[PDB]
Design a binder for this molecule. Structure first.
Ligand SMILES: Cc1cc2nnc(C)n2c2ccccc12
Length: 113
């Protein structure tokens, strides 16, 4: 029960803030399946920030939960695929931690709409 335009503006800003936390840009684009041929064997739904941007503009995110669900996929897919002693796994933990704070503040602002 809100206006579409300000909500999408908020999701755009939020997505930019989450990308800022991924300083290595390891989640910016889809996991390269040509370099990771076994990736789809374990990961049923790949996700990344570029795909999230396309979904946002395609109106796939009309509430905060669906936006946050795809962010959580970025994190959980990486924790699942990679061993704990890898940079990838630790980067996903760090993104979960730093991204969670970004998301809580942004959801509060959506709730004011
Ligand atoms: C191999 C690999 C594994 C991997 N797991 N999660 C992510 C994100 N990745 C990558 C991202 C960019 C390039 C390679 C990978």
């Amino acid at each position: 029960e809100m206006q579409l335009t300000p909500f999408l503006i908020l999701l755009r800003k939020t997505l930019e803030q989450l990308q800022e936390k991924d300083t290595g840009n390891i989640f910016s684009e889809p996991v390269p399946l040509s370099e990771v041929p076994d990736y789809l064997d374990h990961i049923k739904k790949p996700m990344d920030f570029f795909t999230m941007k396309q979904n946002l503009e395609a109106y796939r995110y009309l509430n905060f939960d669906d936006f946050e669900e795809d962010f959580n996929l970025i994190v959980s897919n990486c924790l699942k695929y990679n061993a704990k002693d890898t940079i990838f796994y630790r980067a996903a933990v760090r993104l979960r931690e730093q991204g969670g704070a970004v998301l809580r503040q942004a959801r509060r602002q959506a709730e004011k709409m």
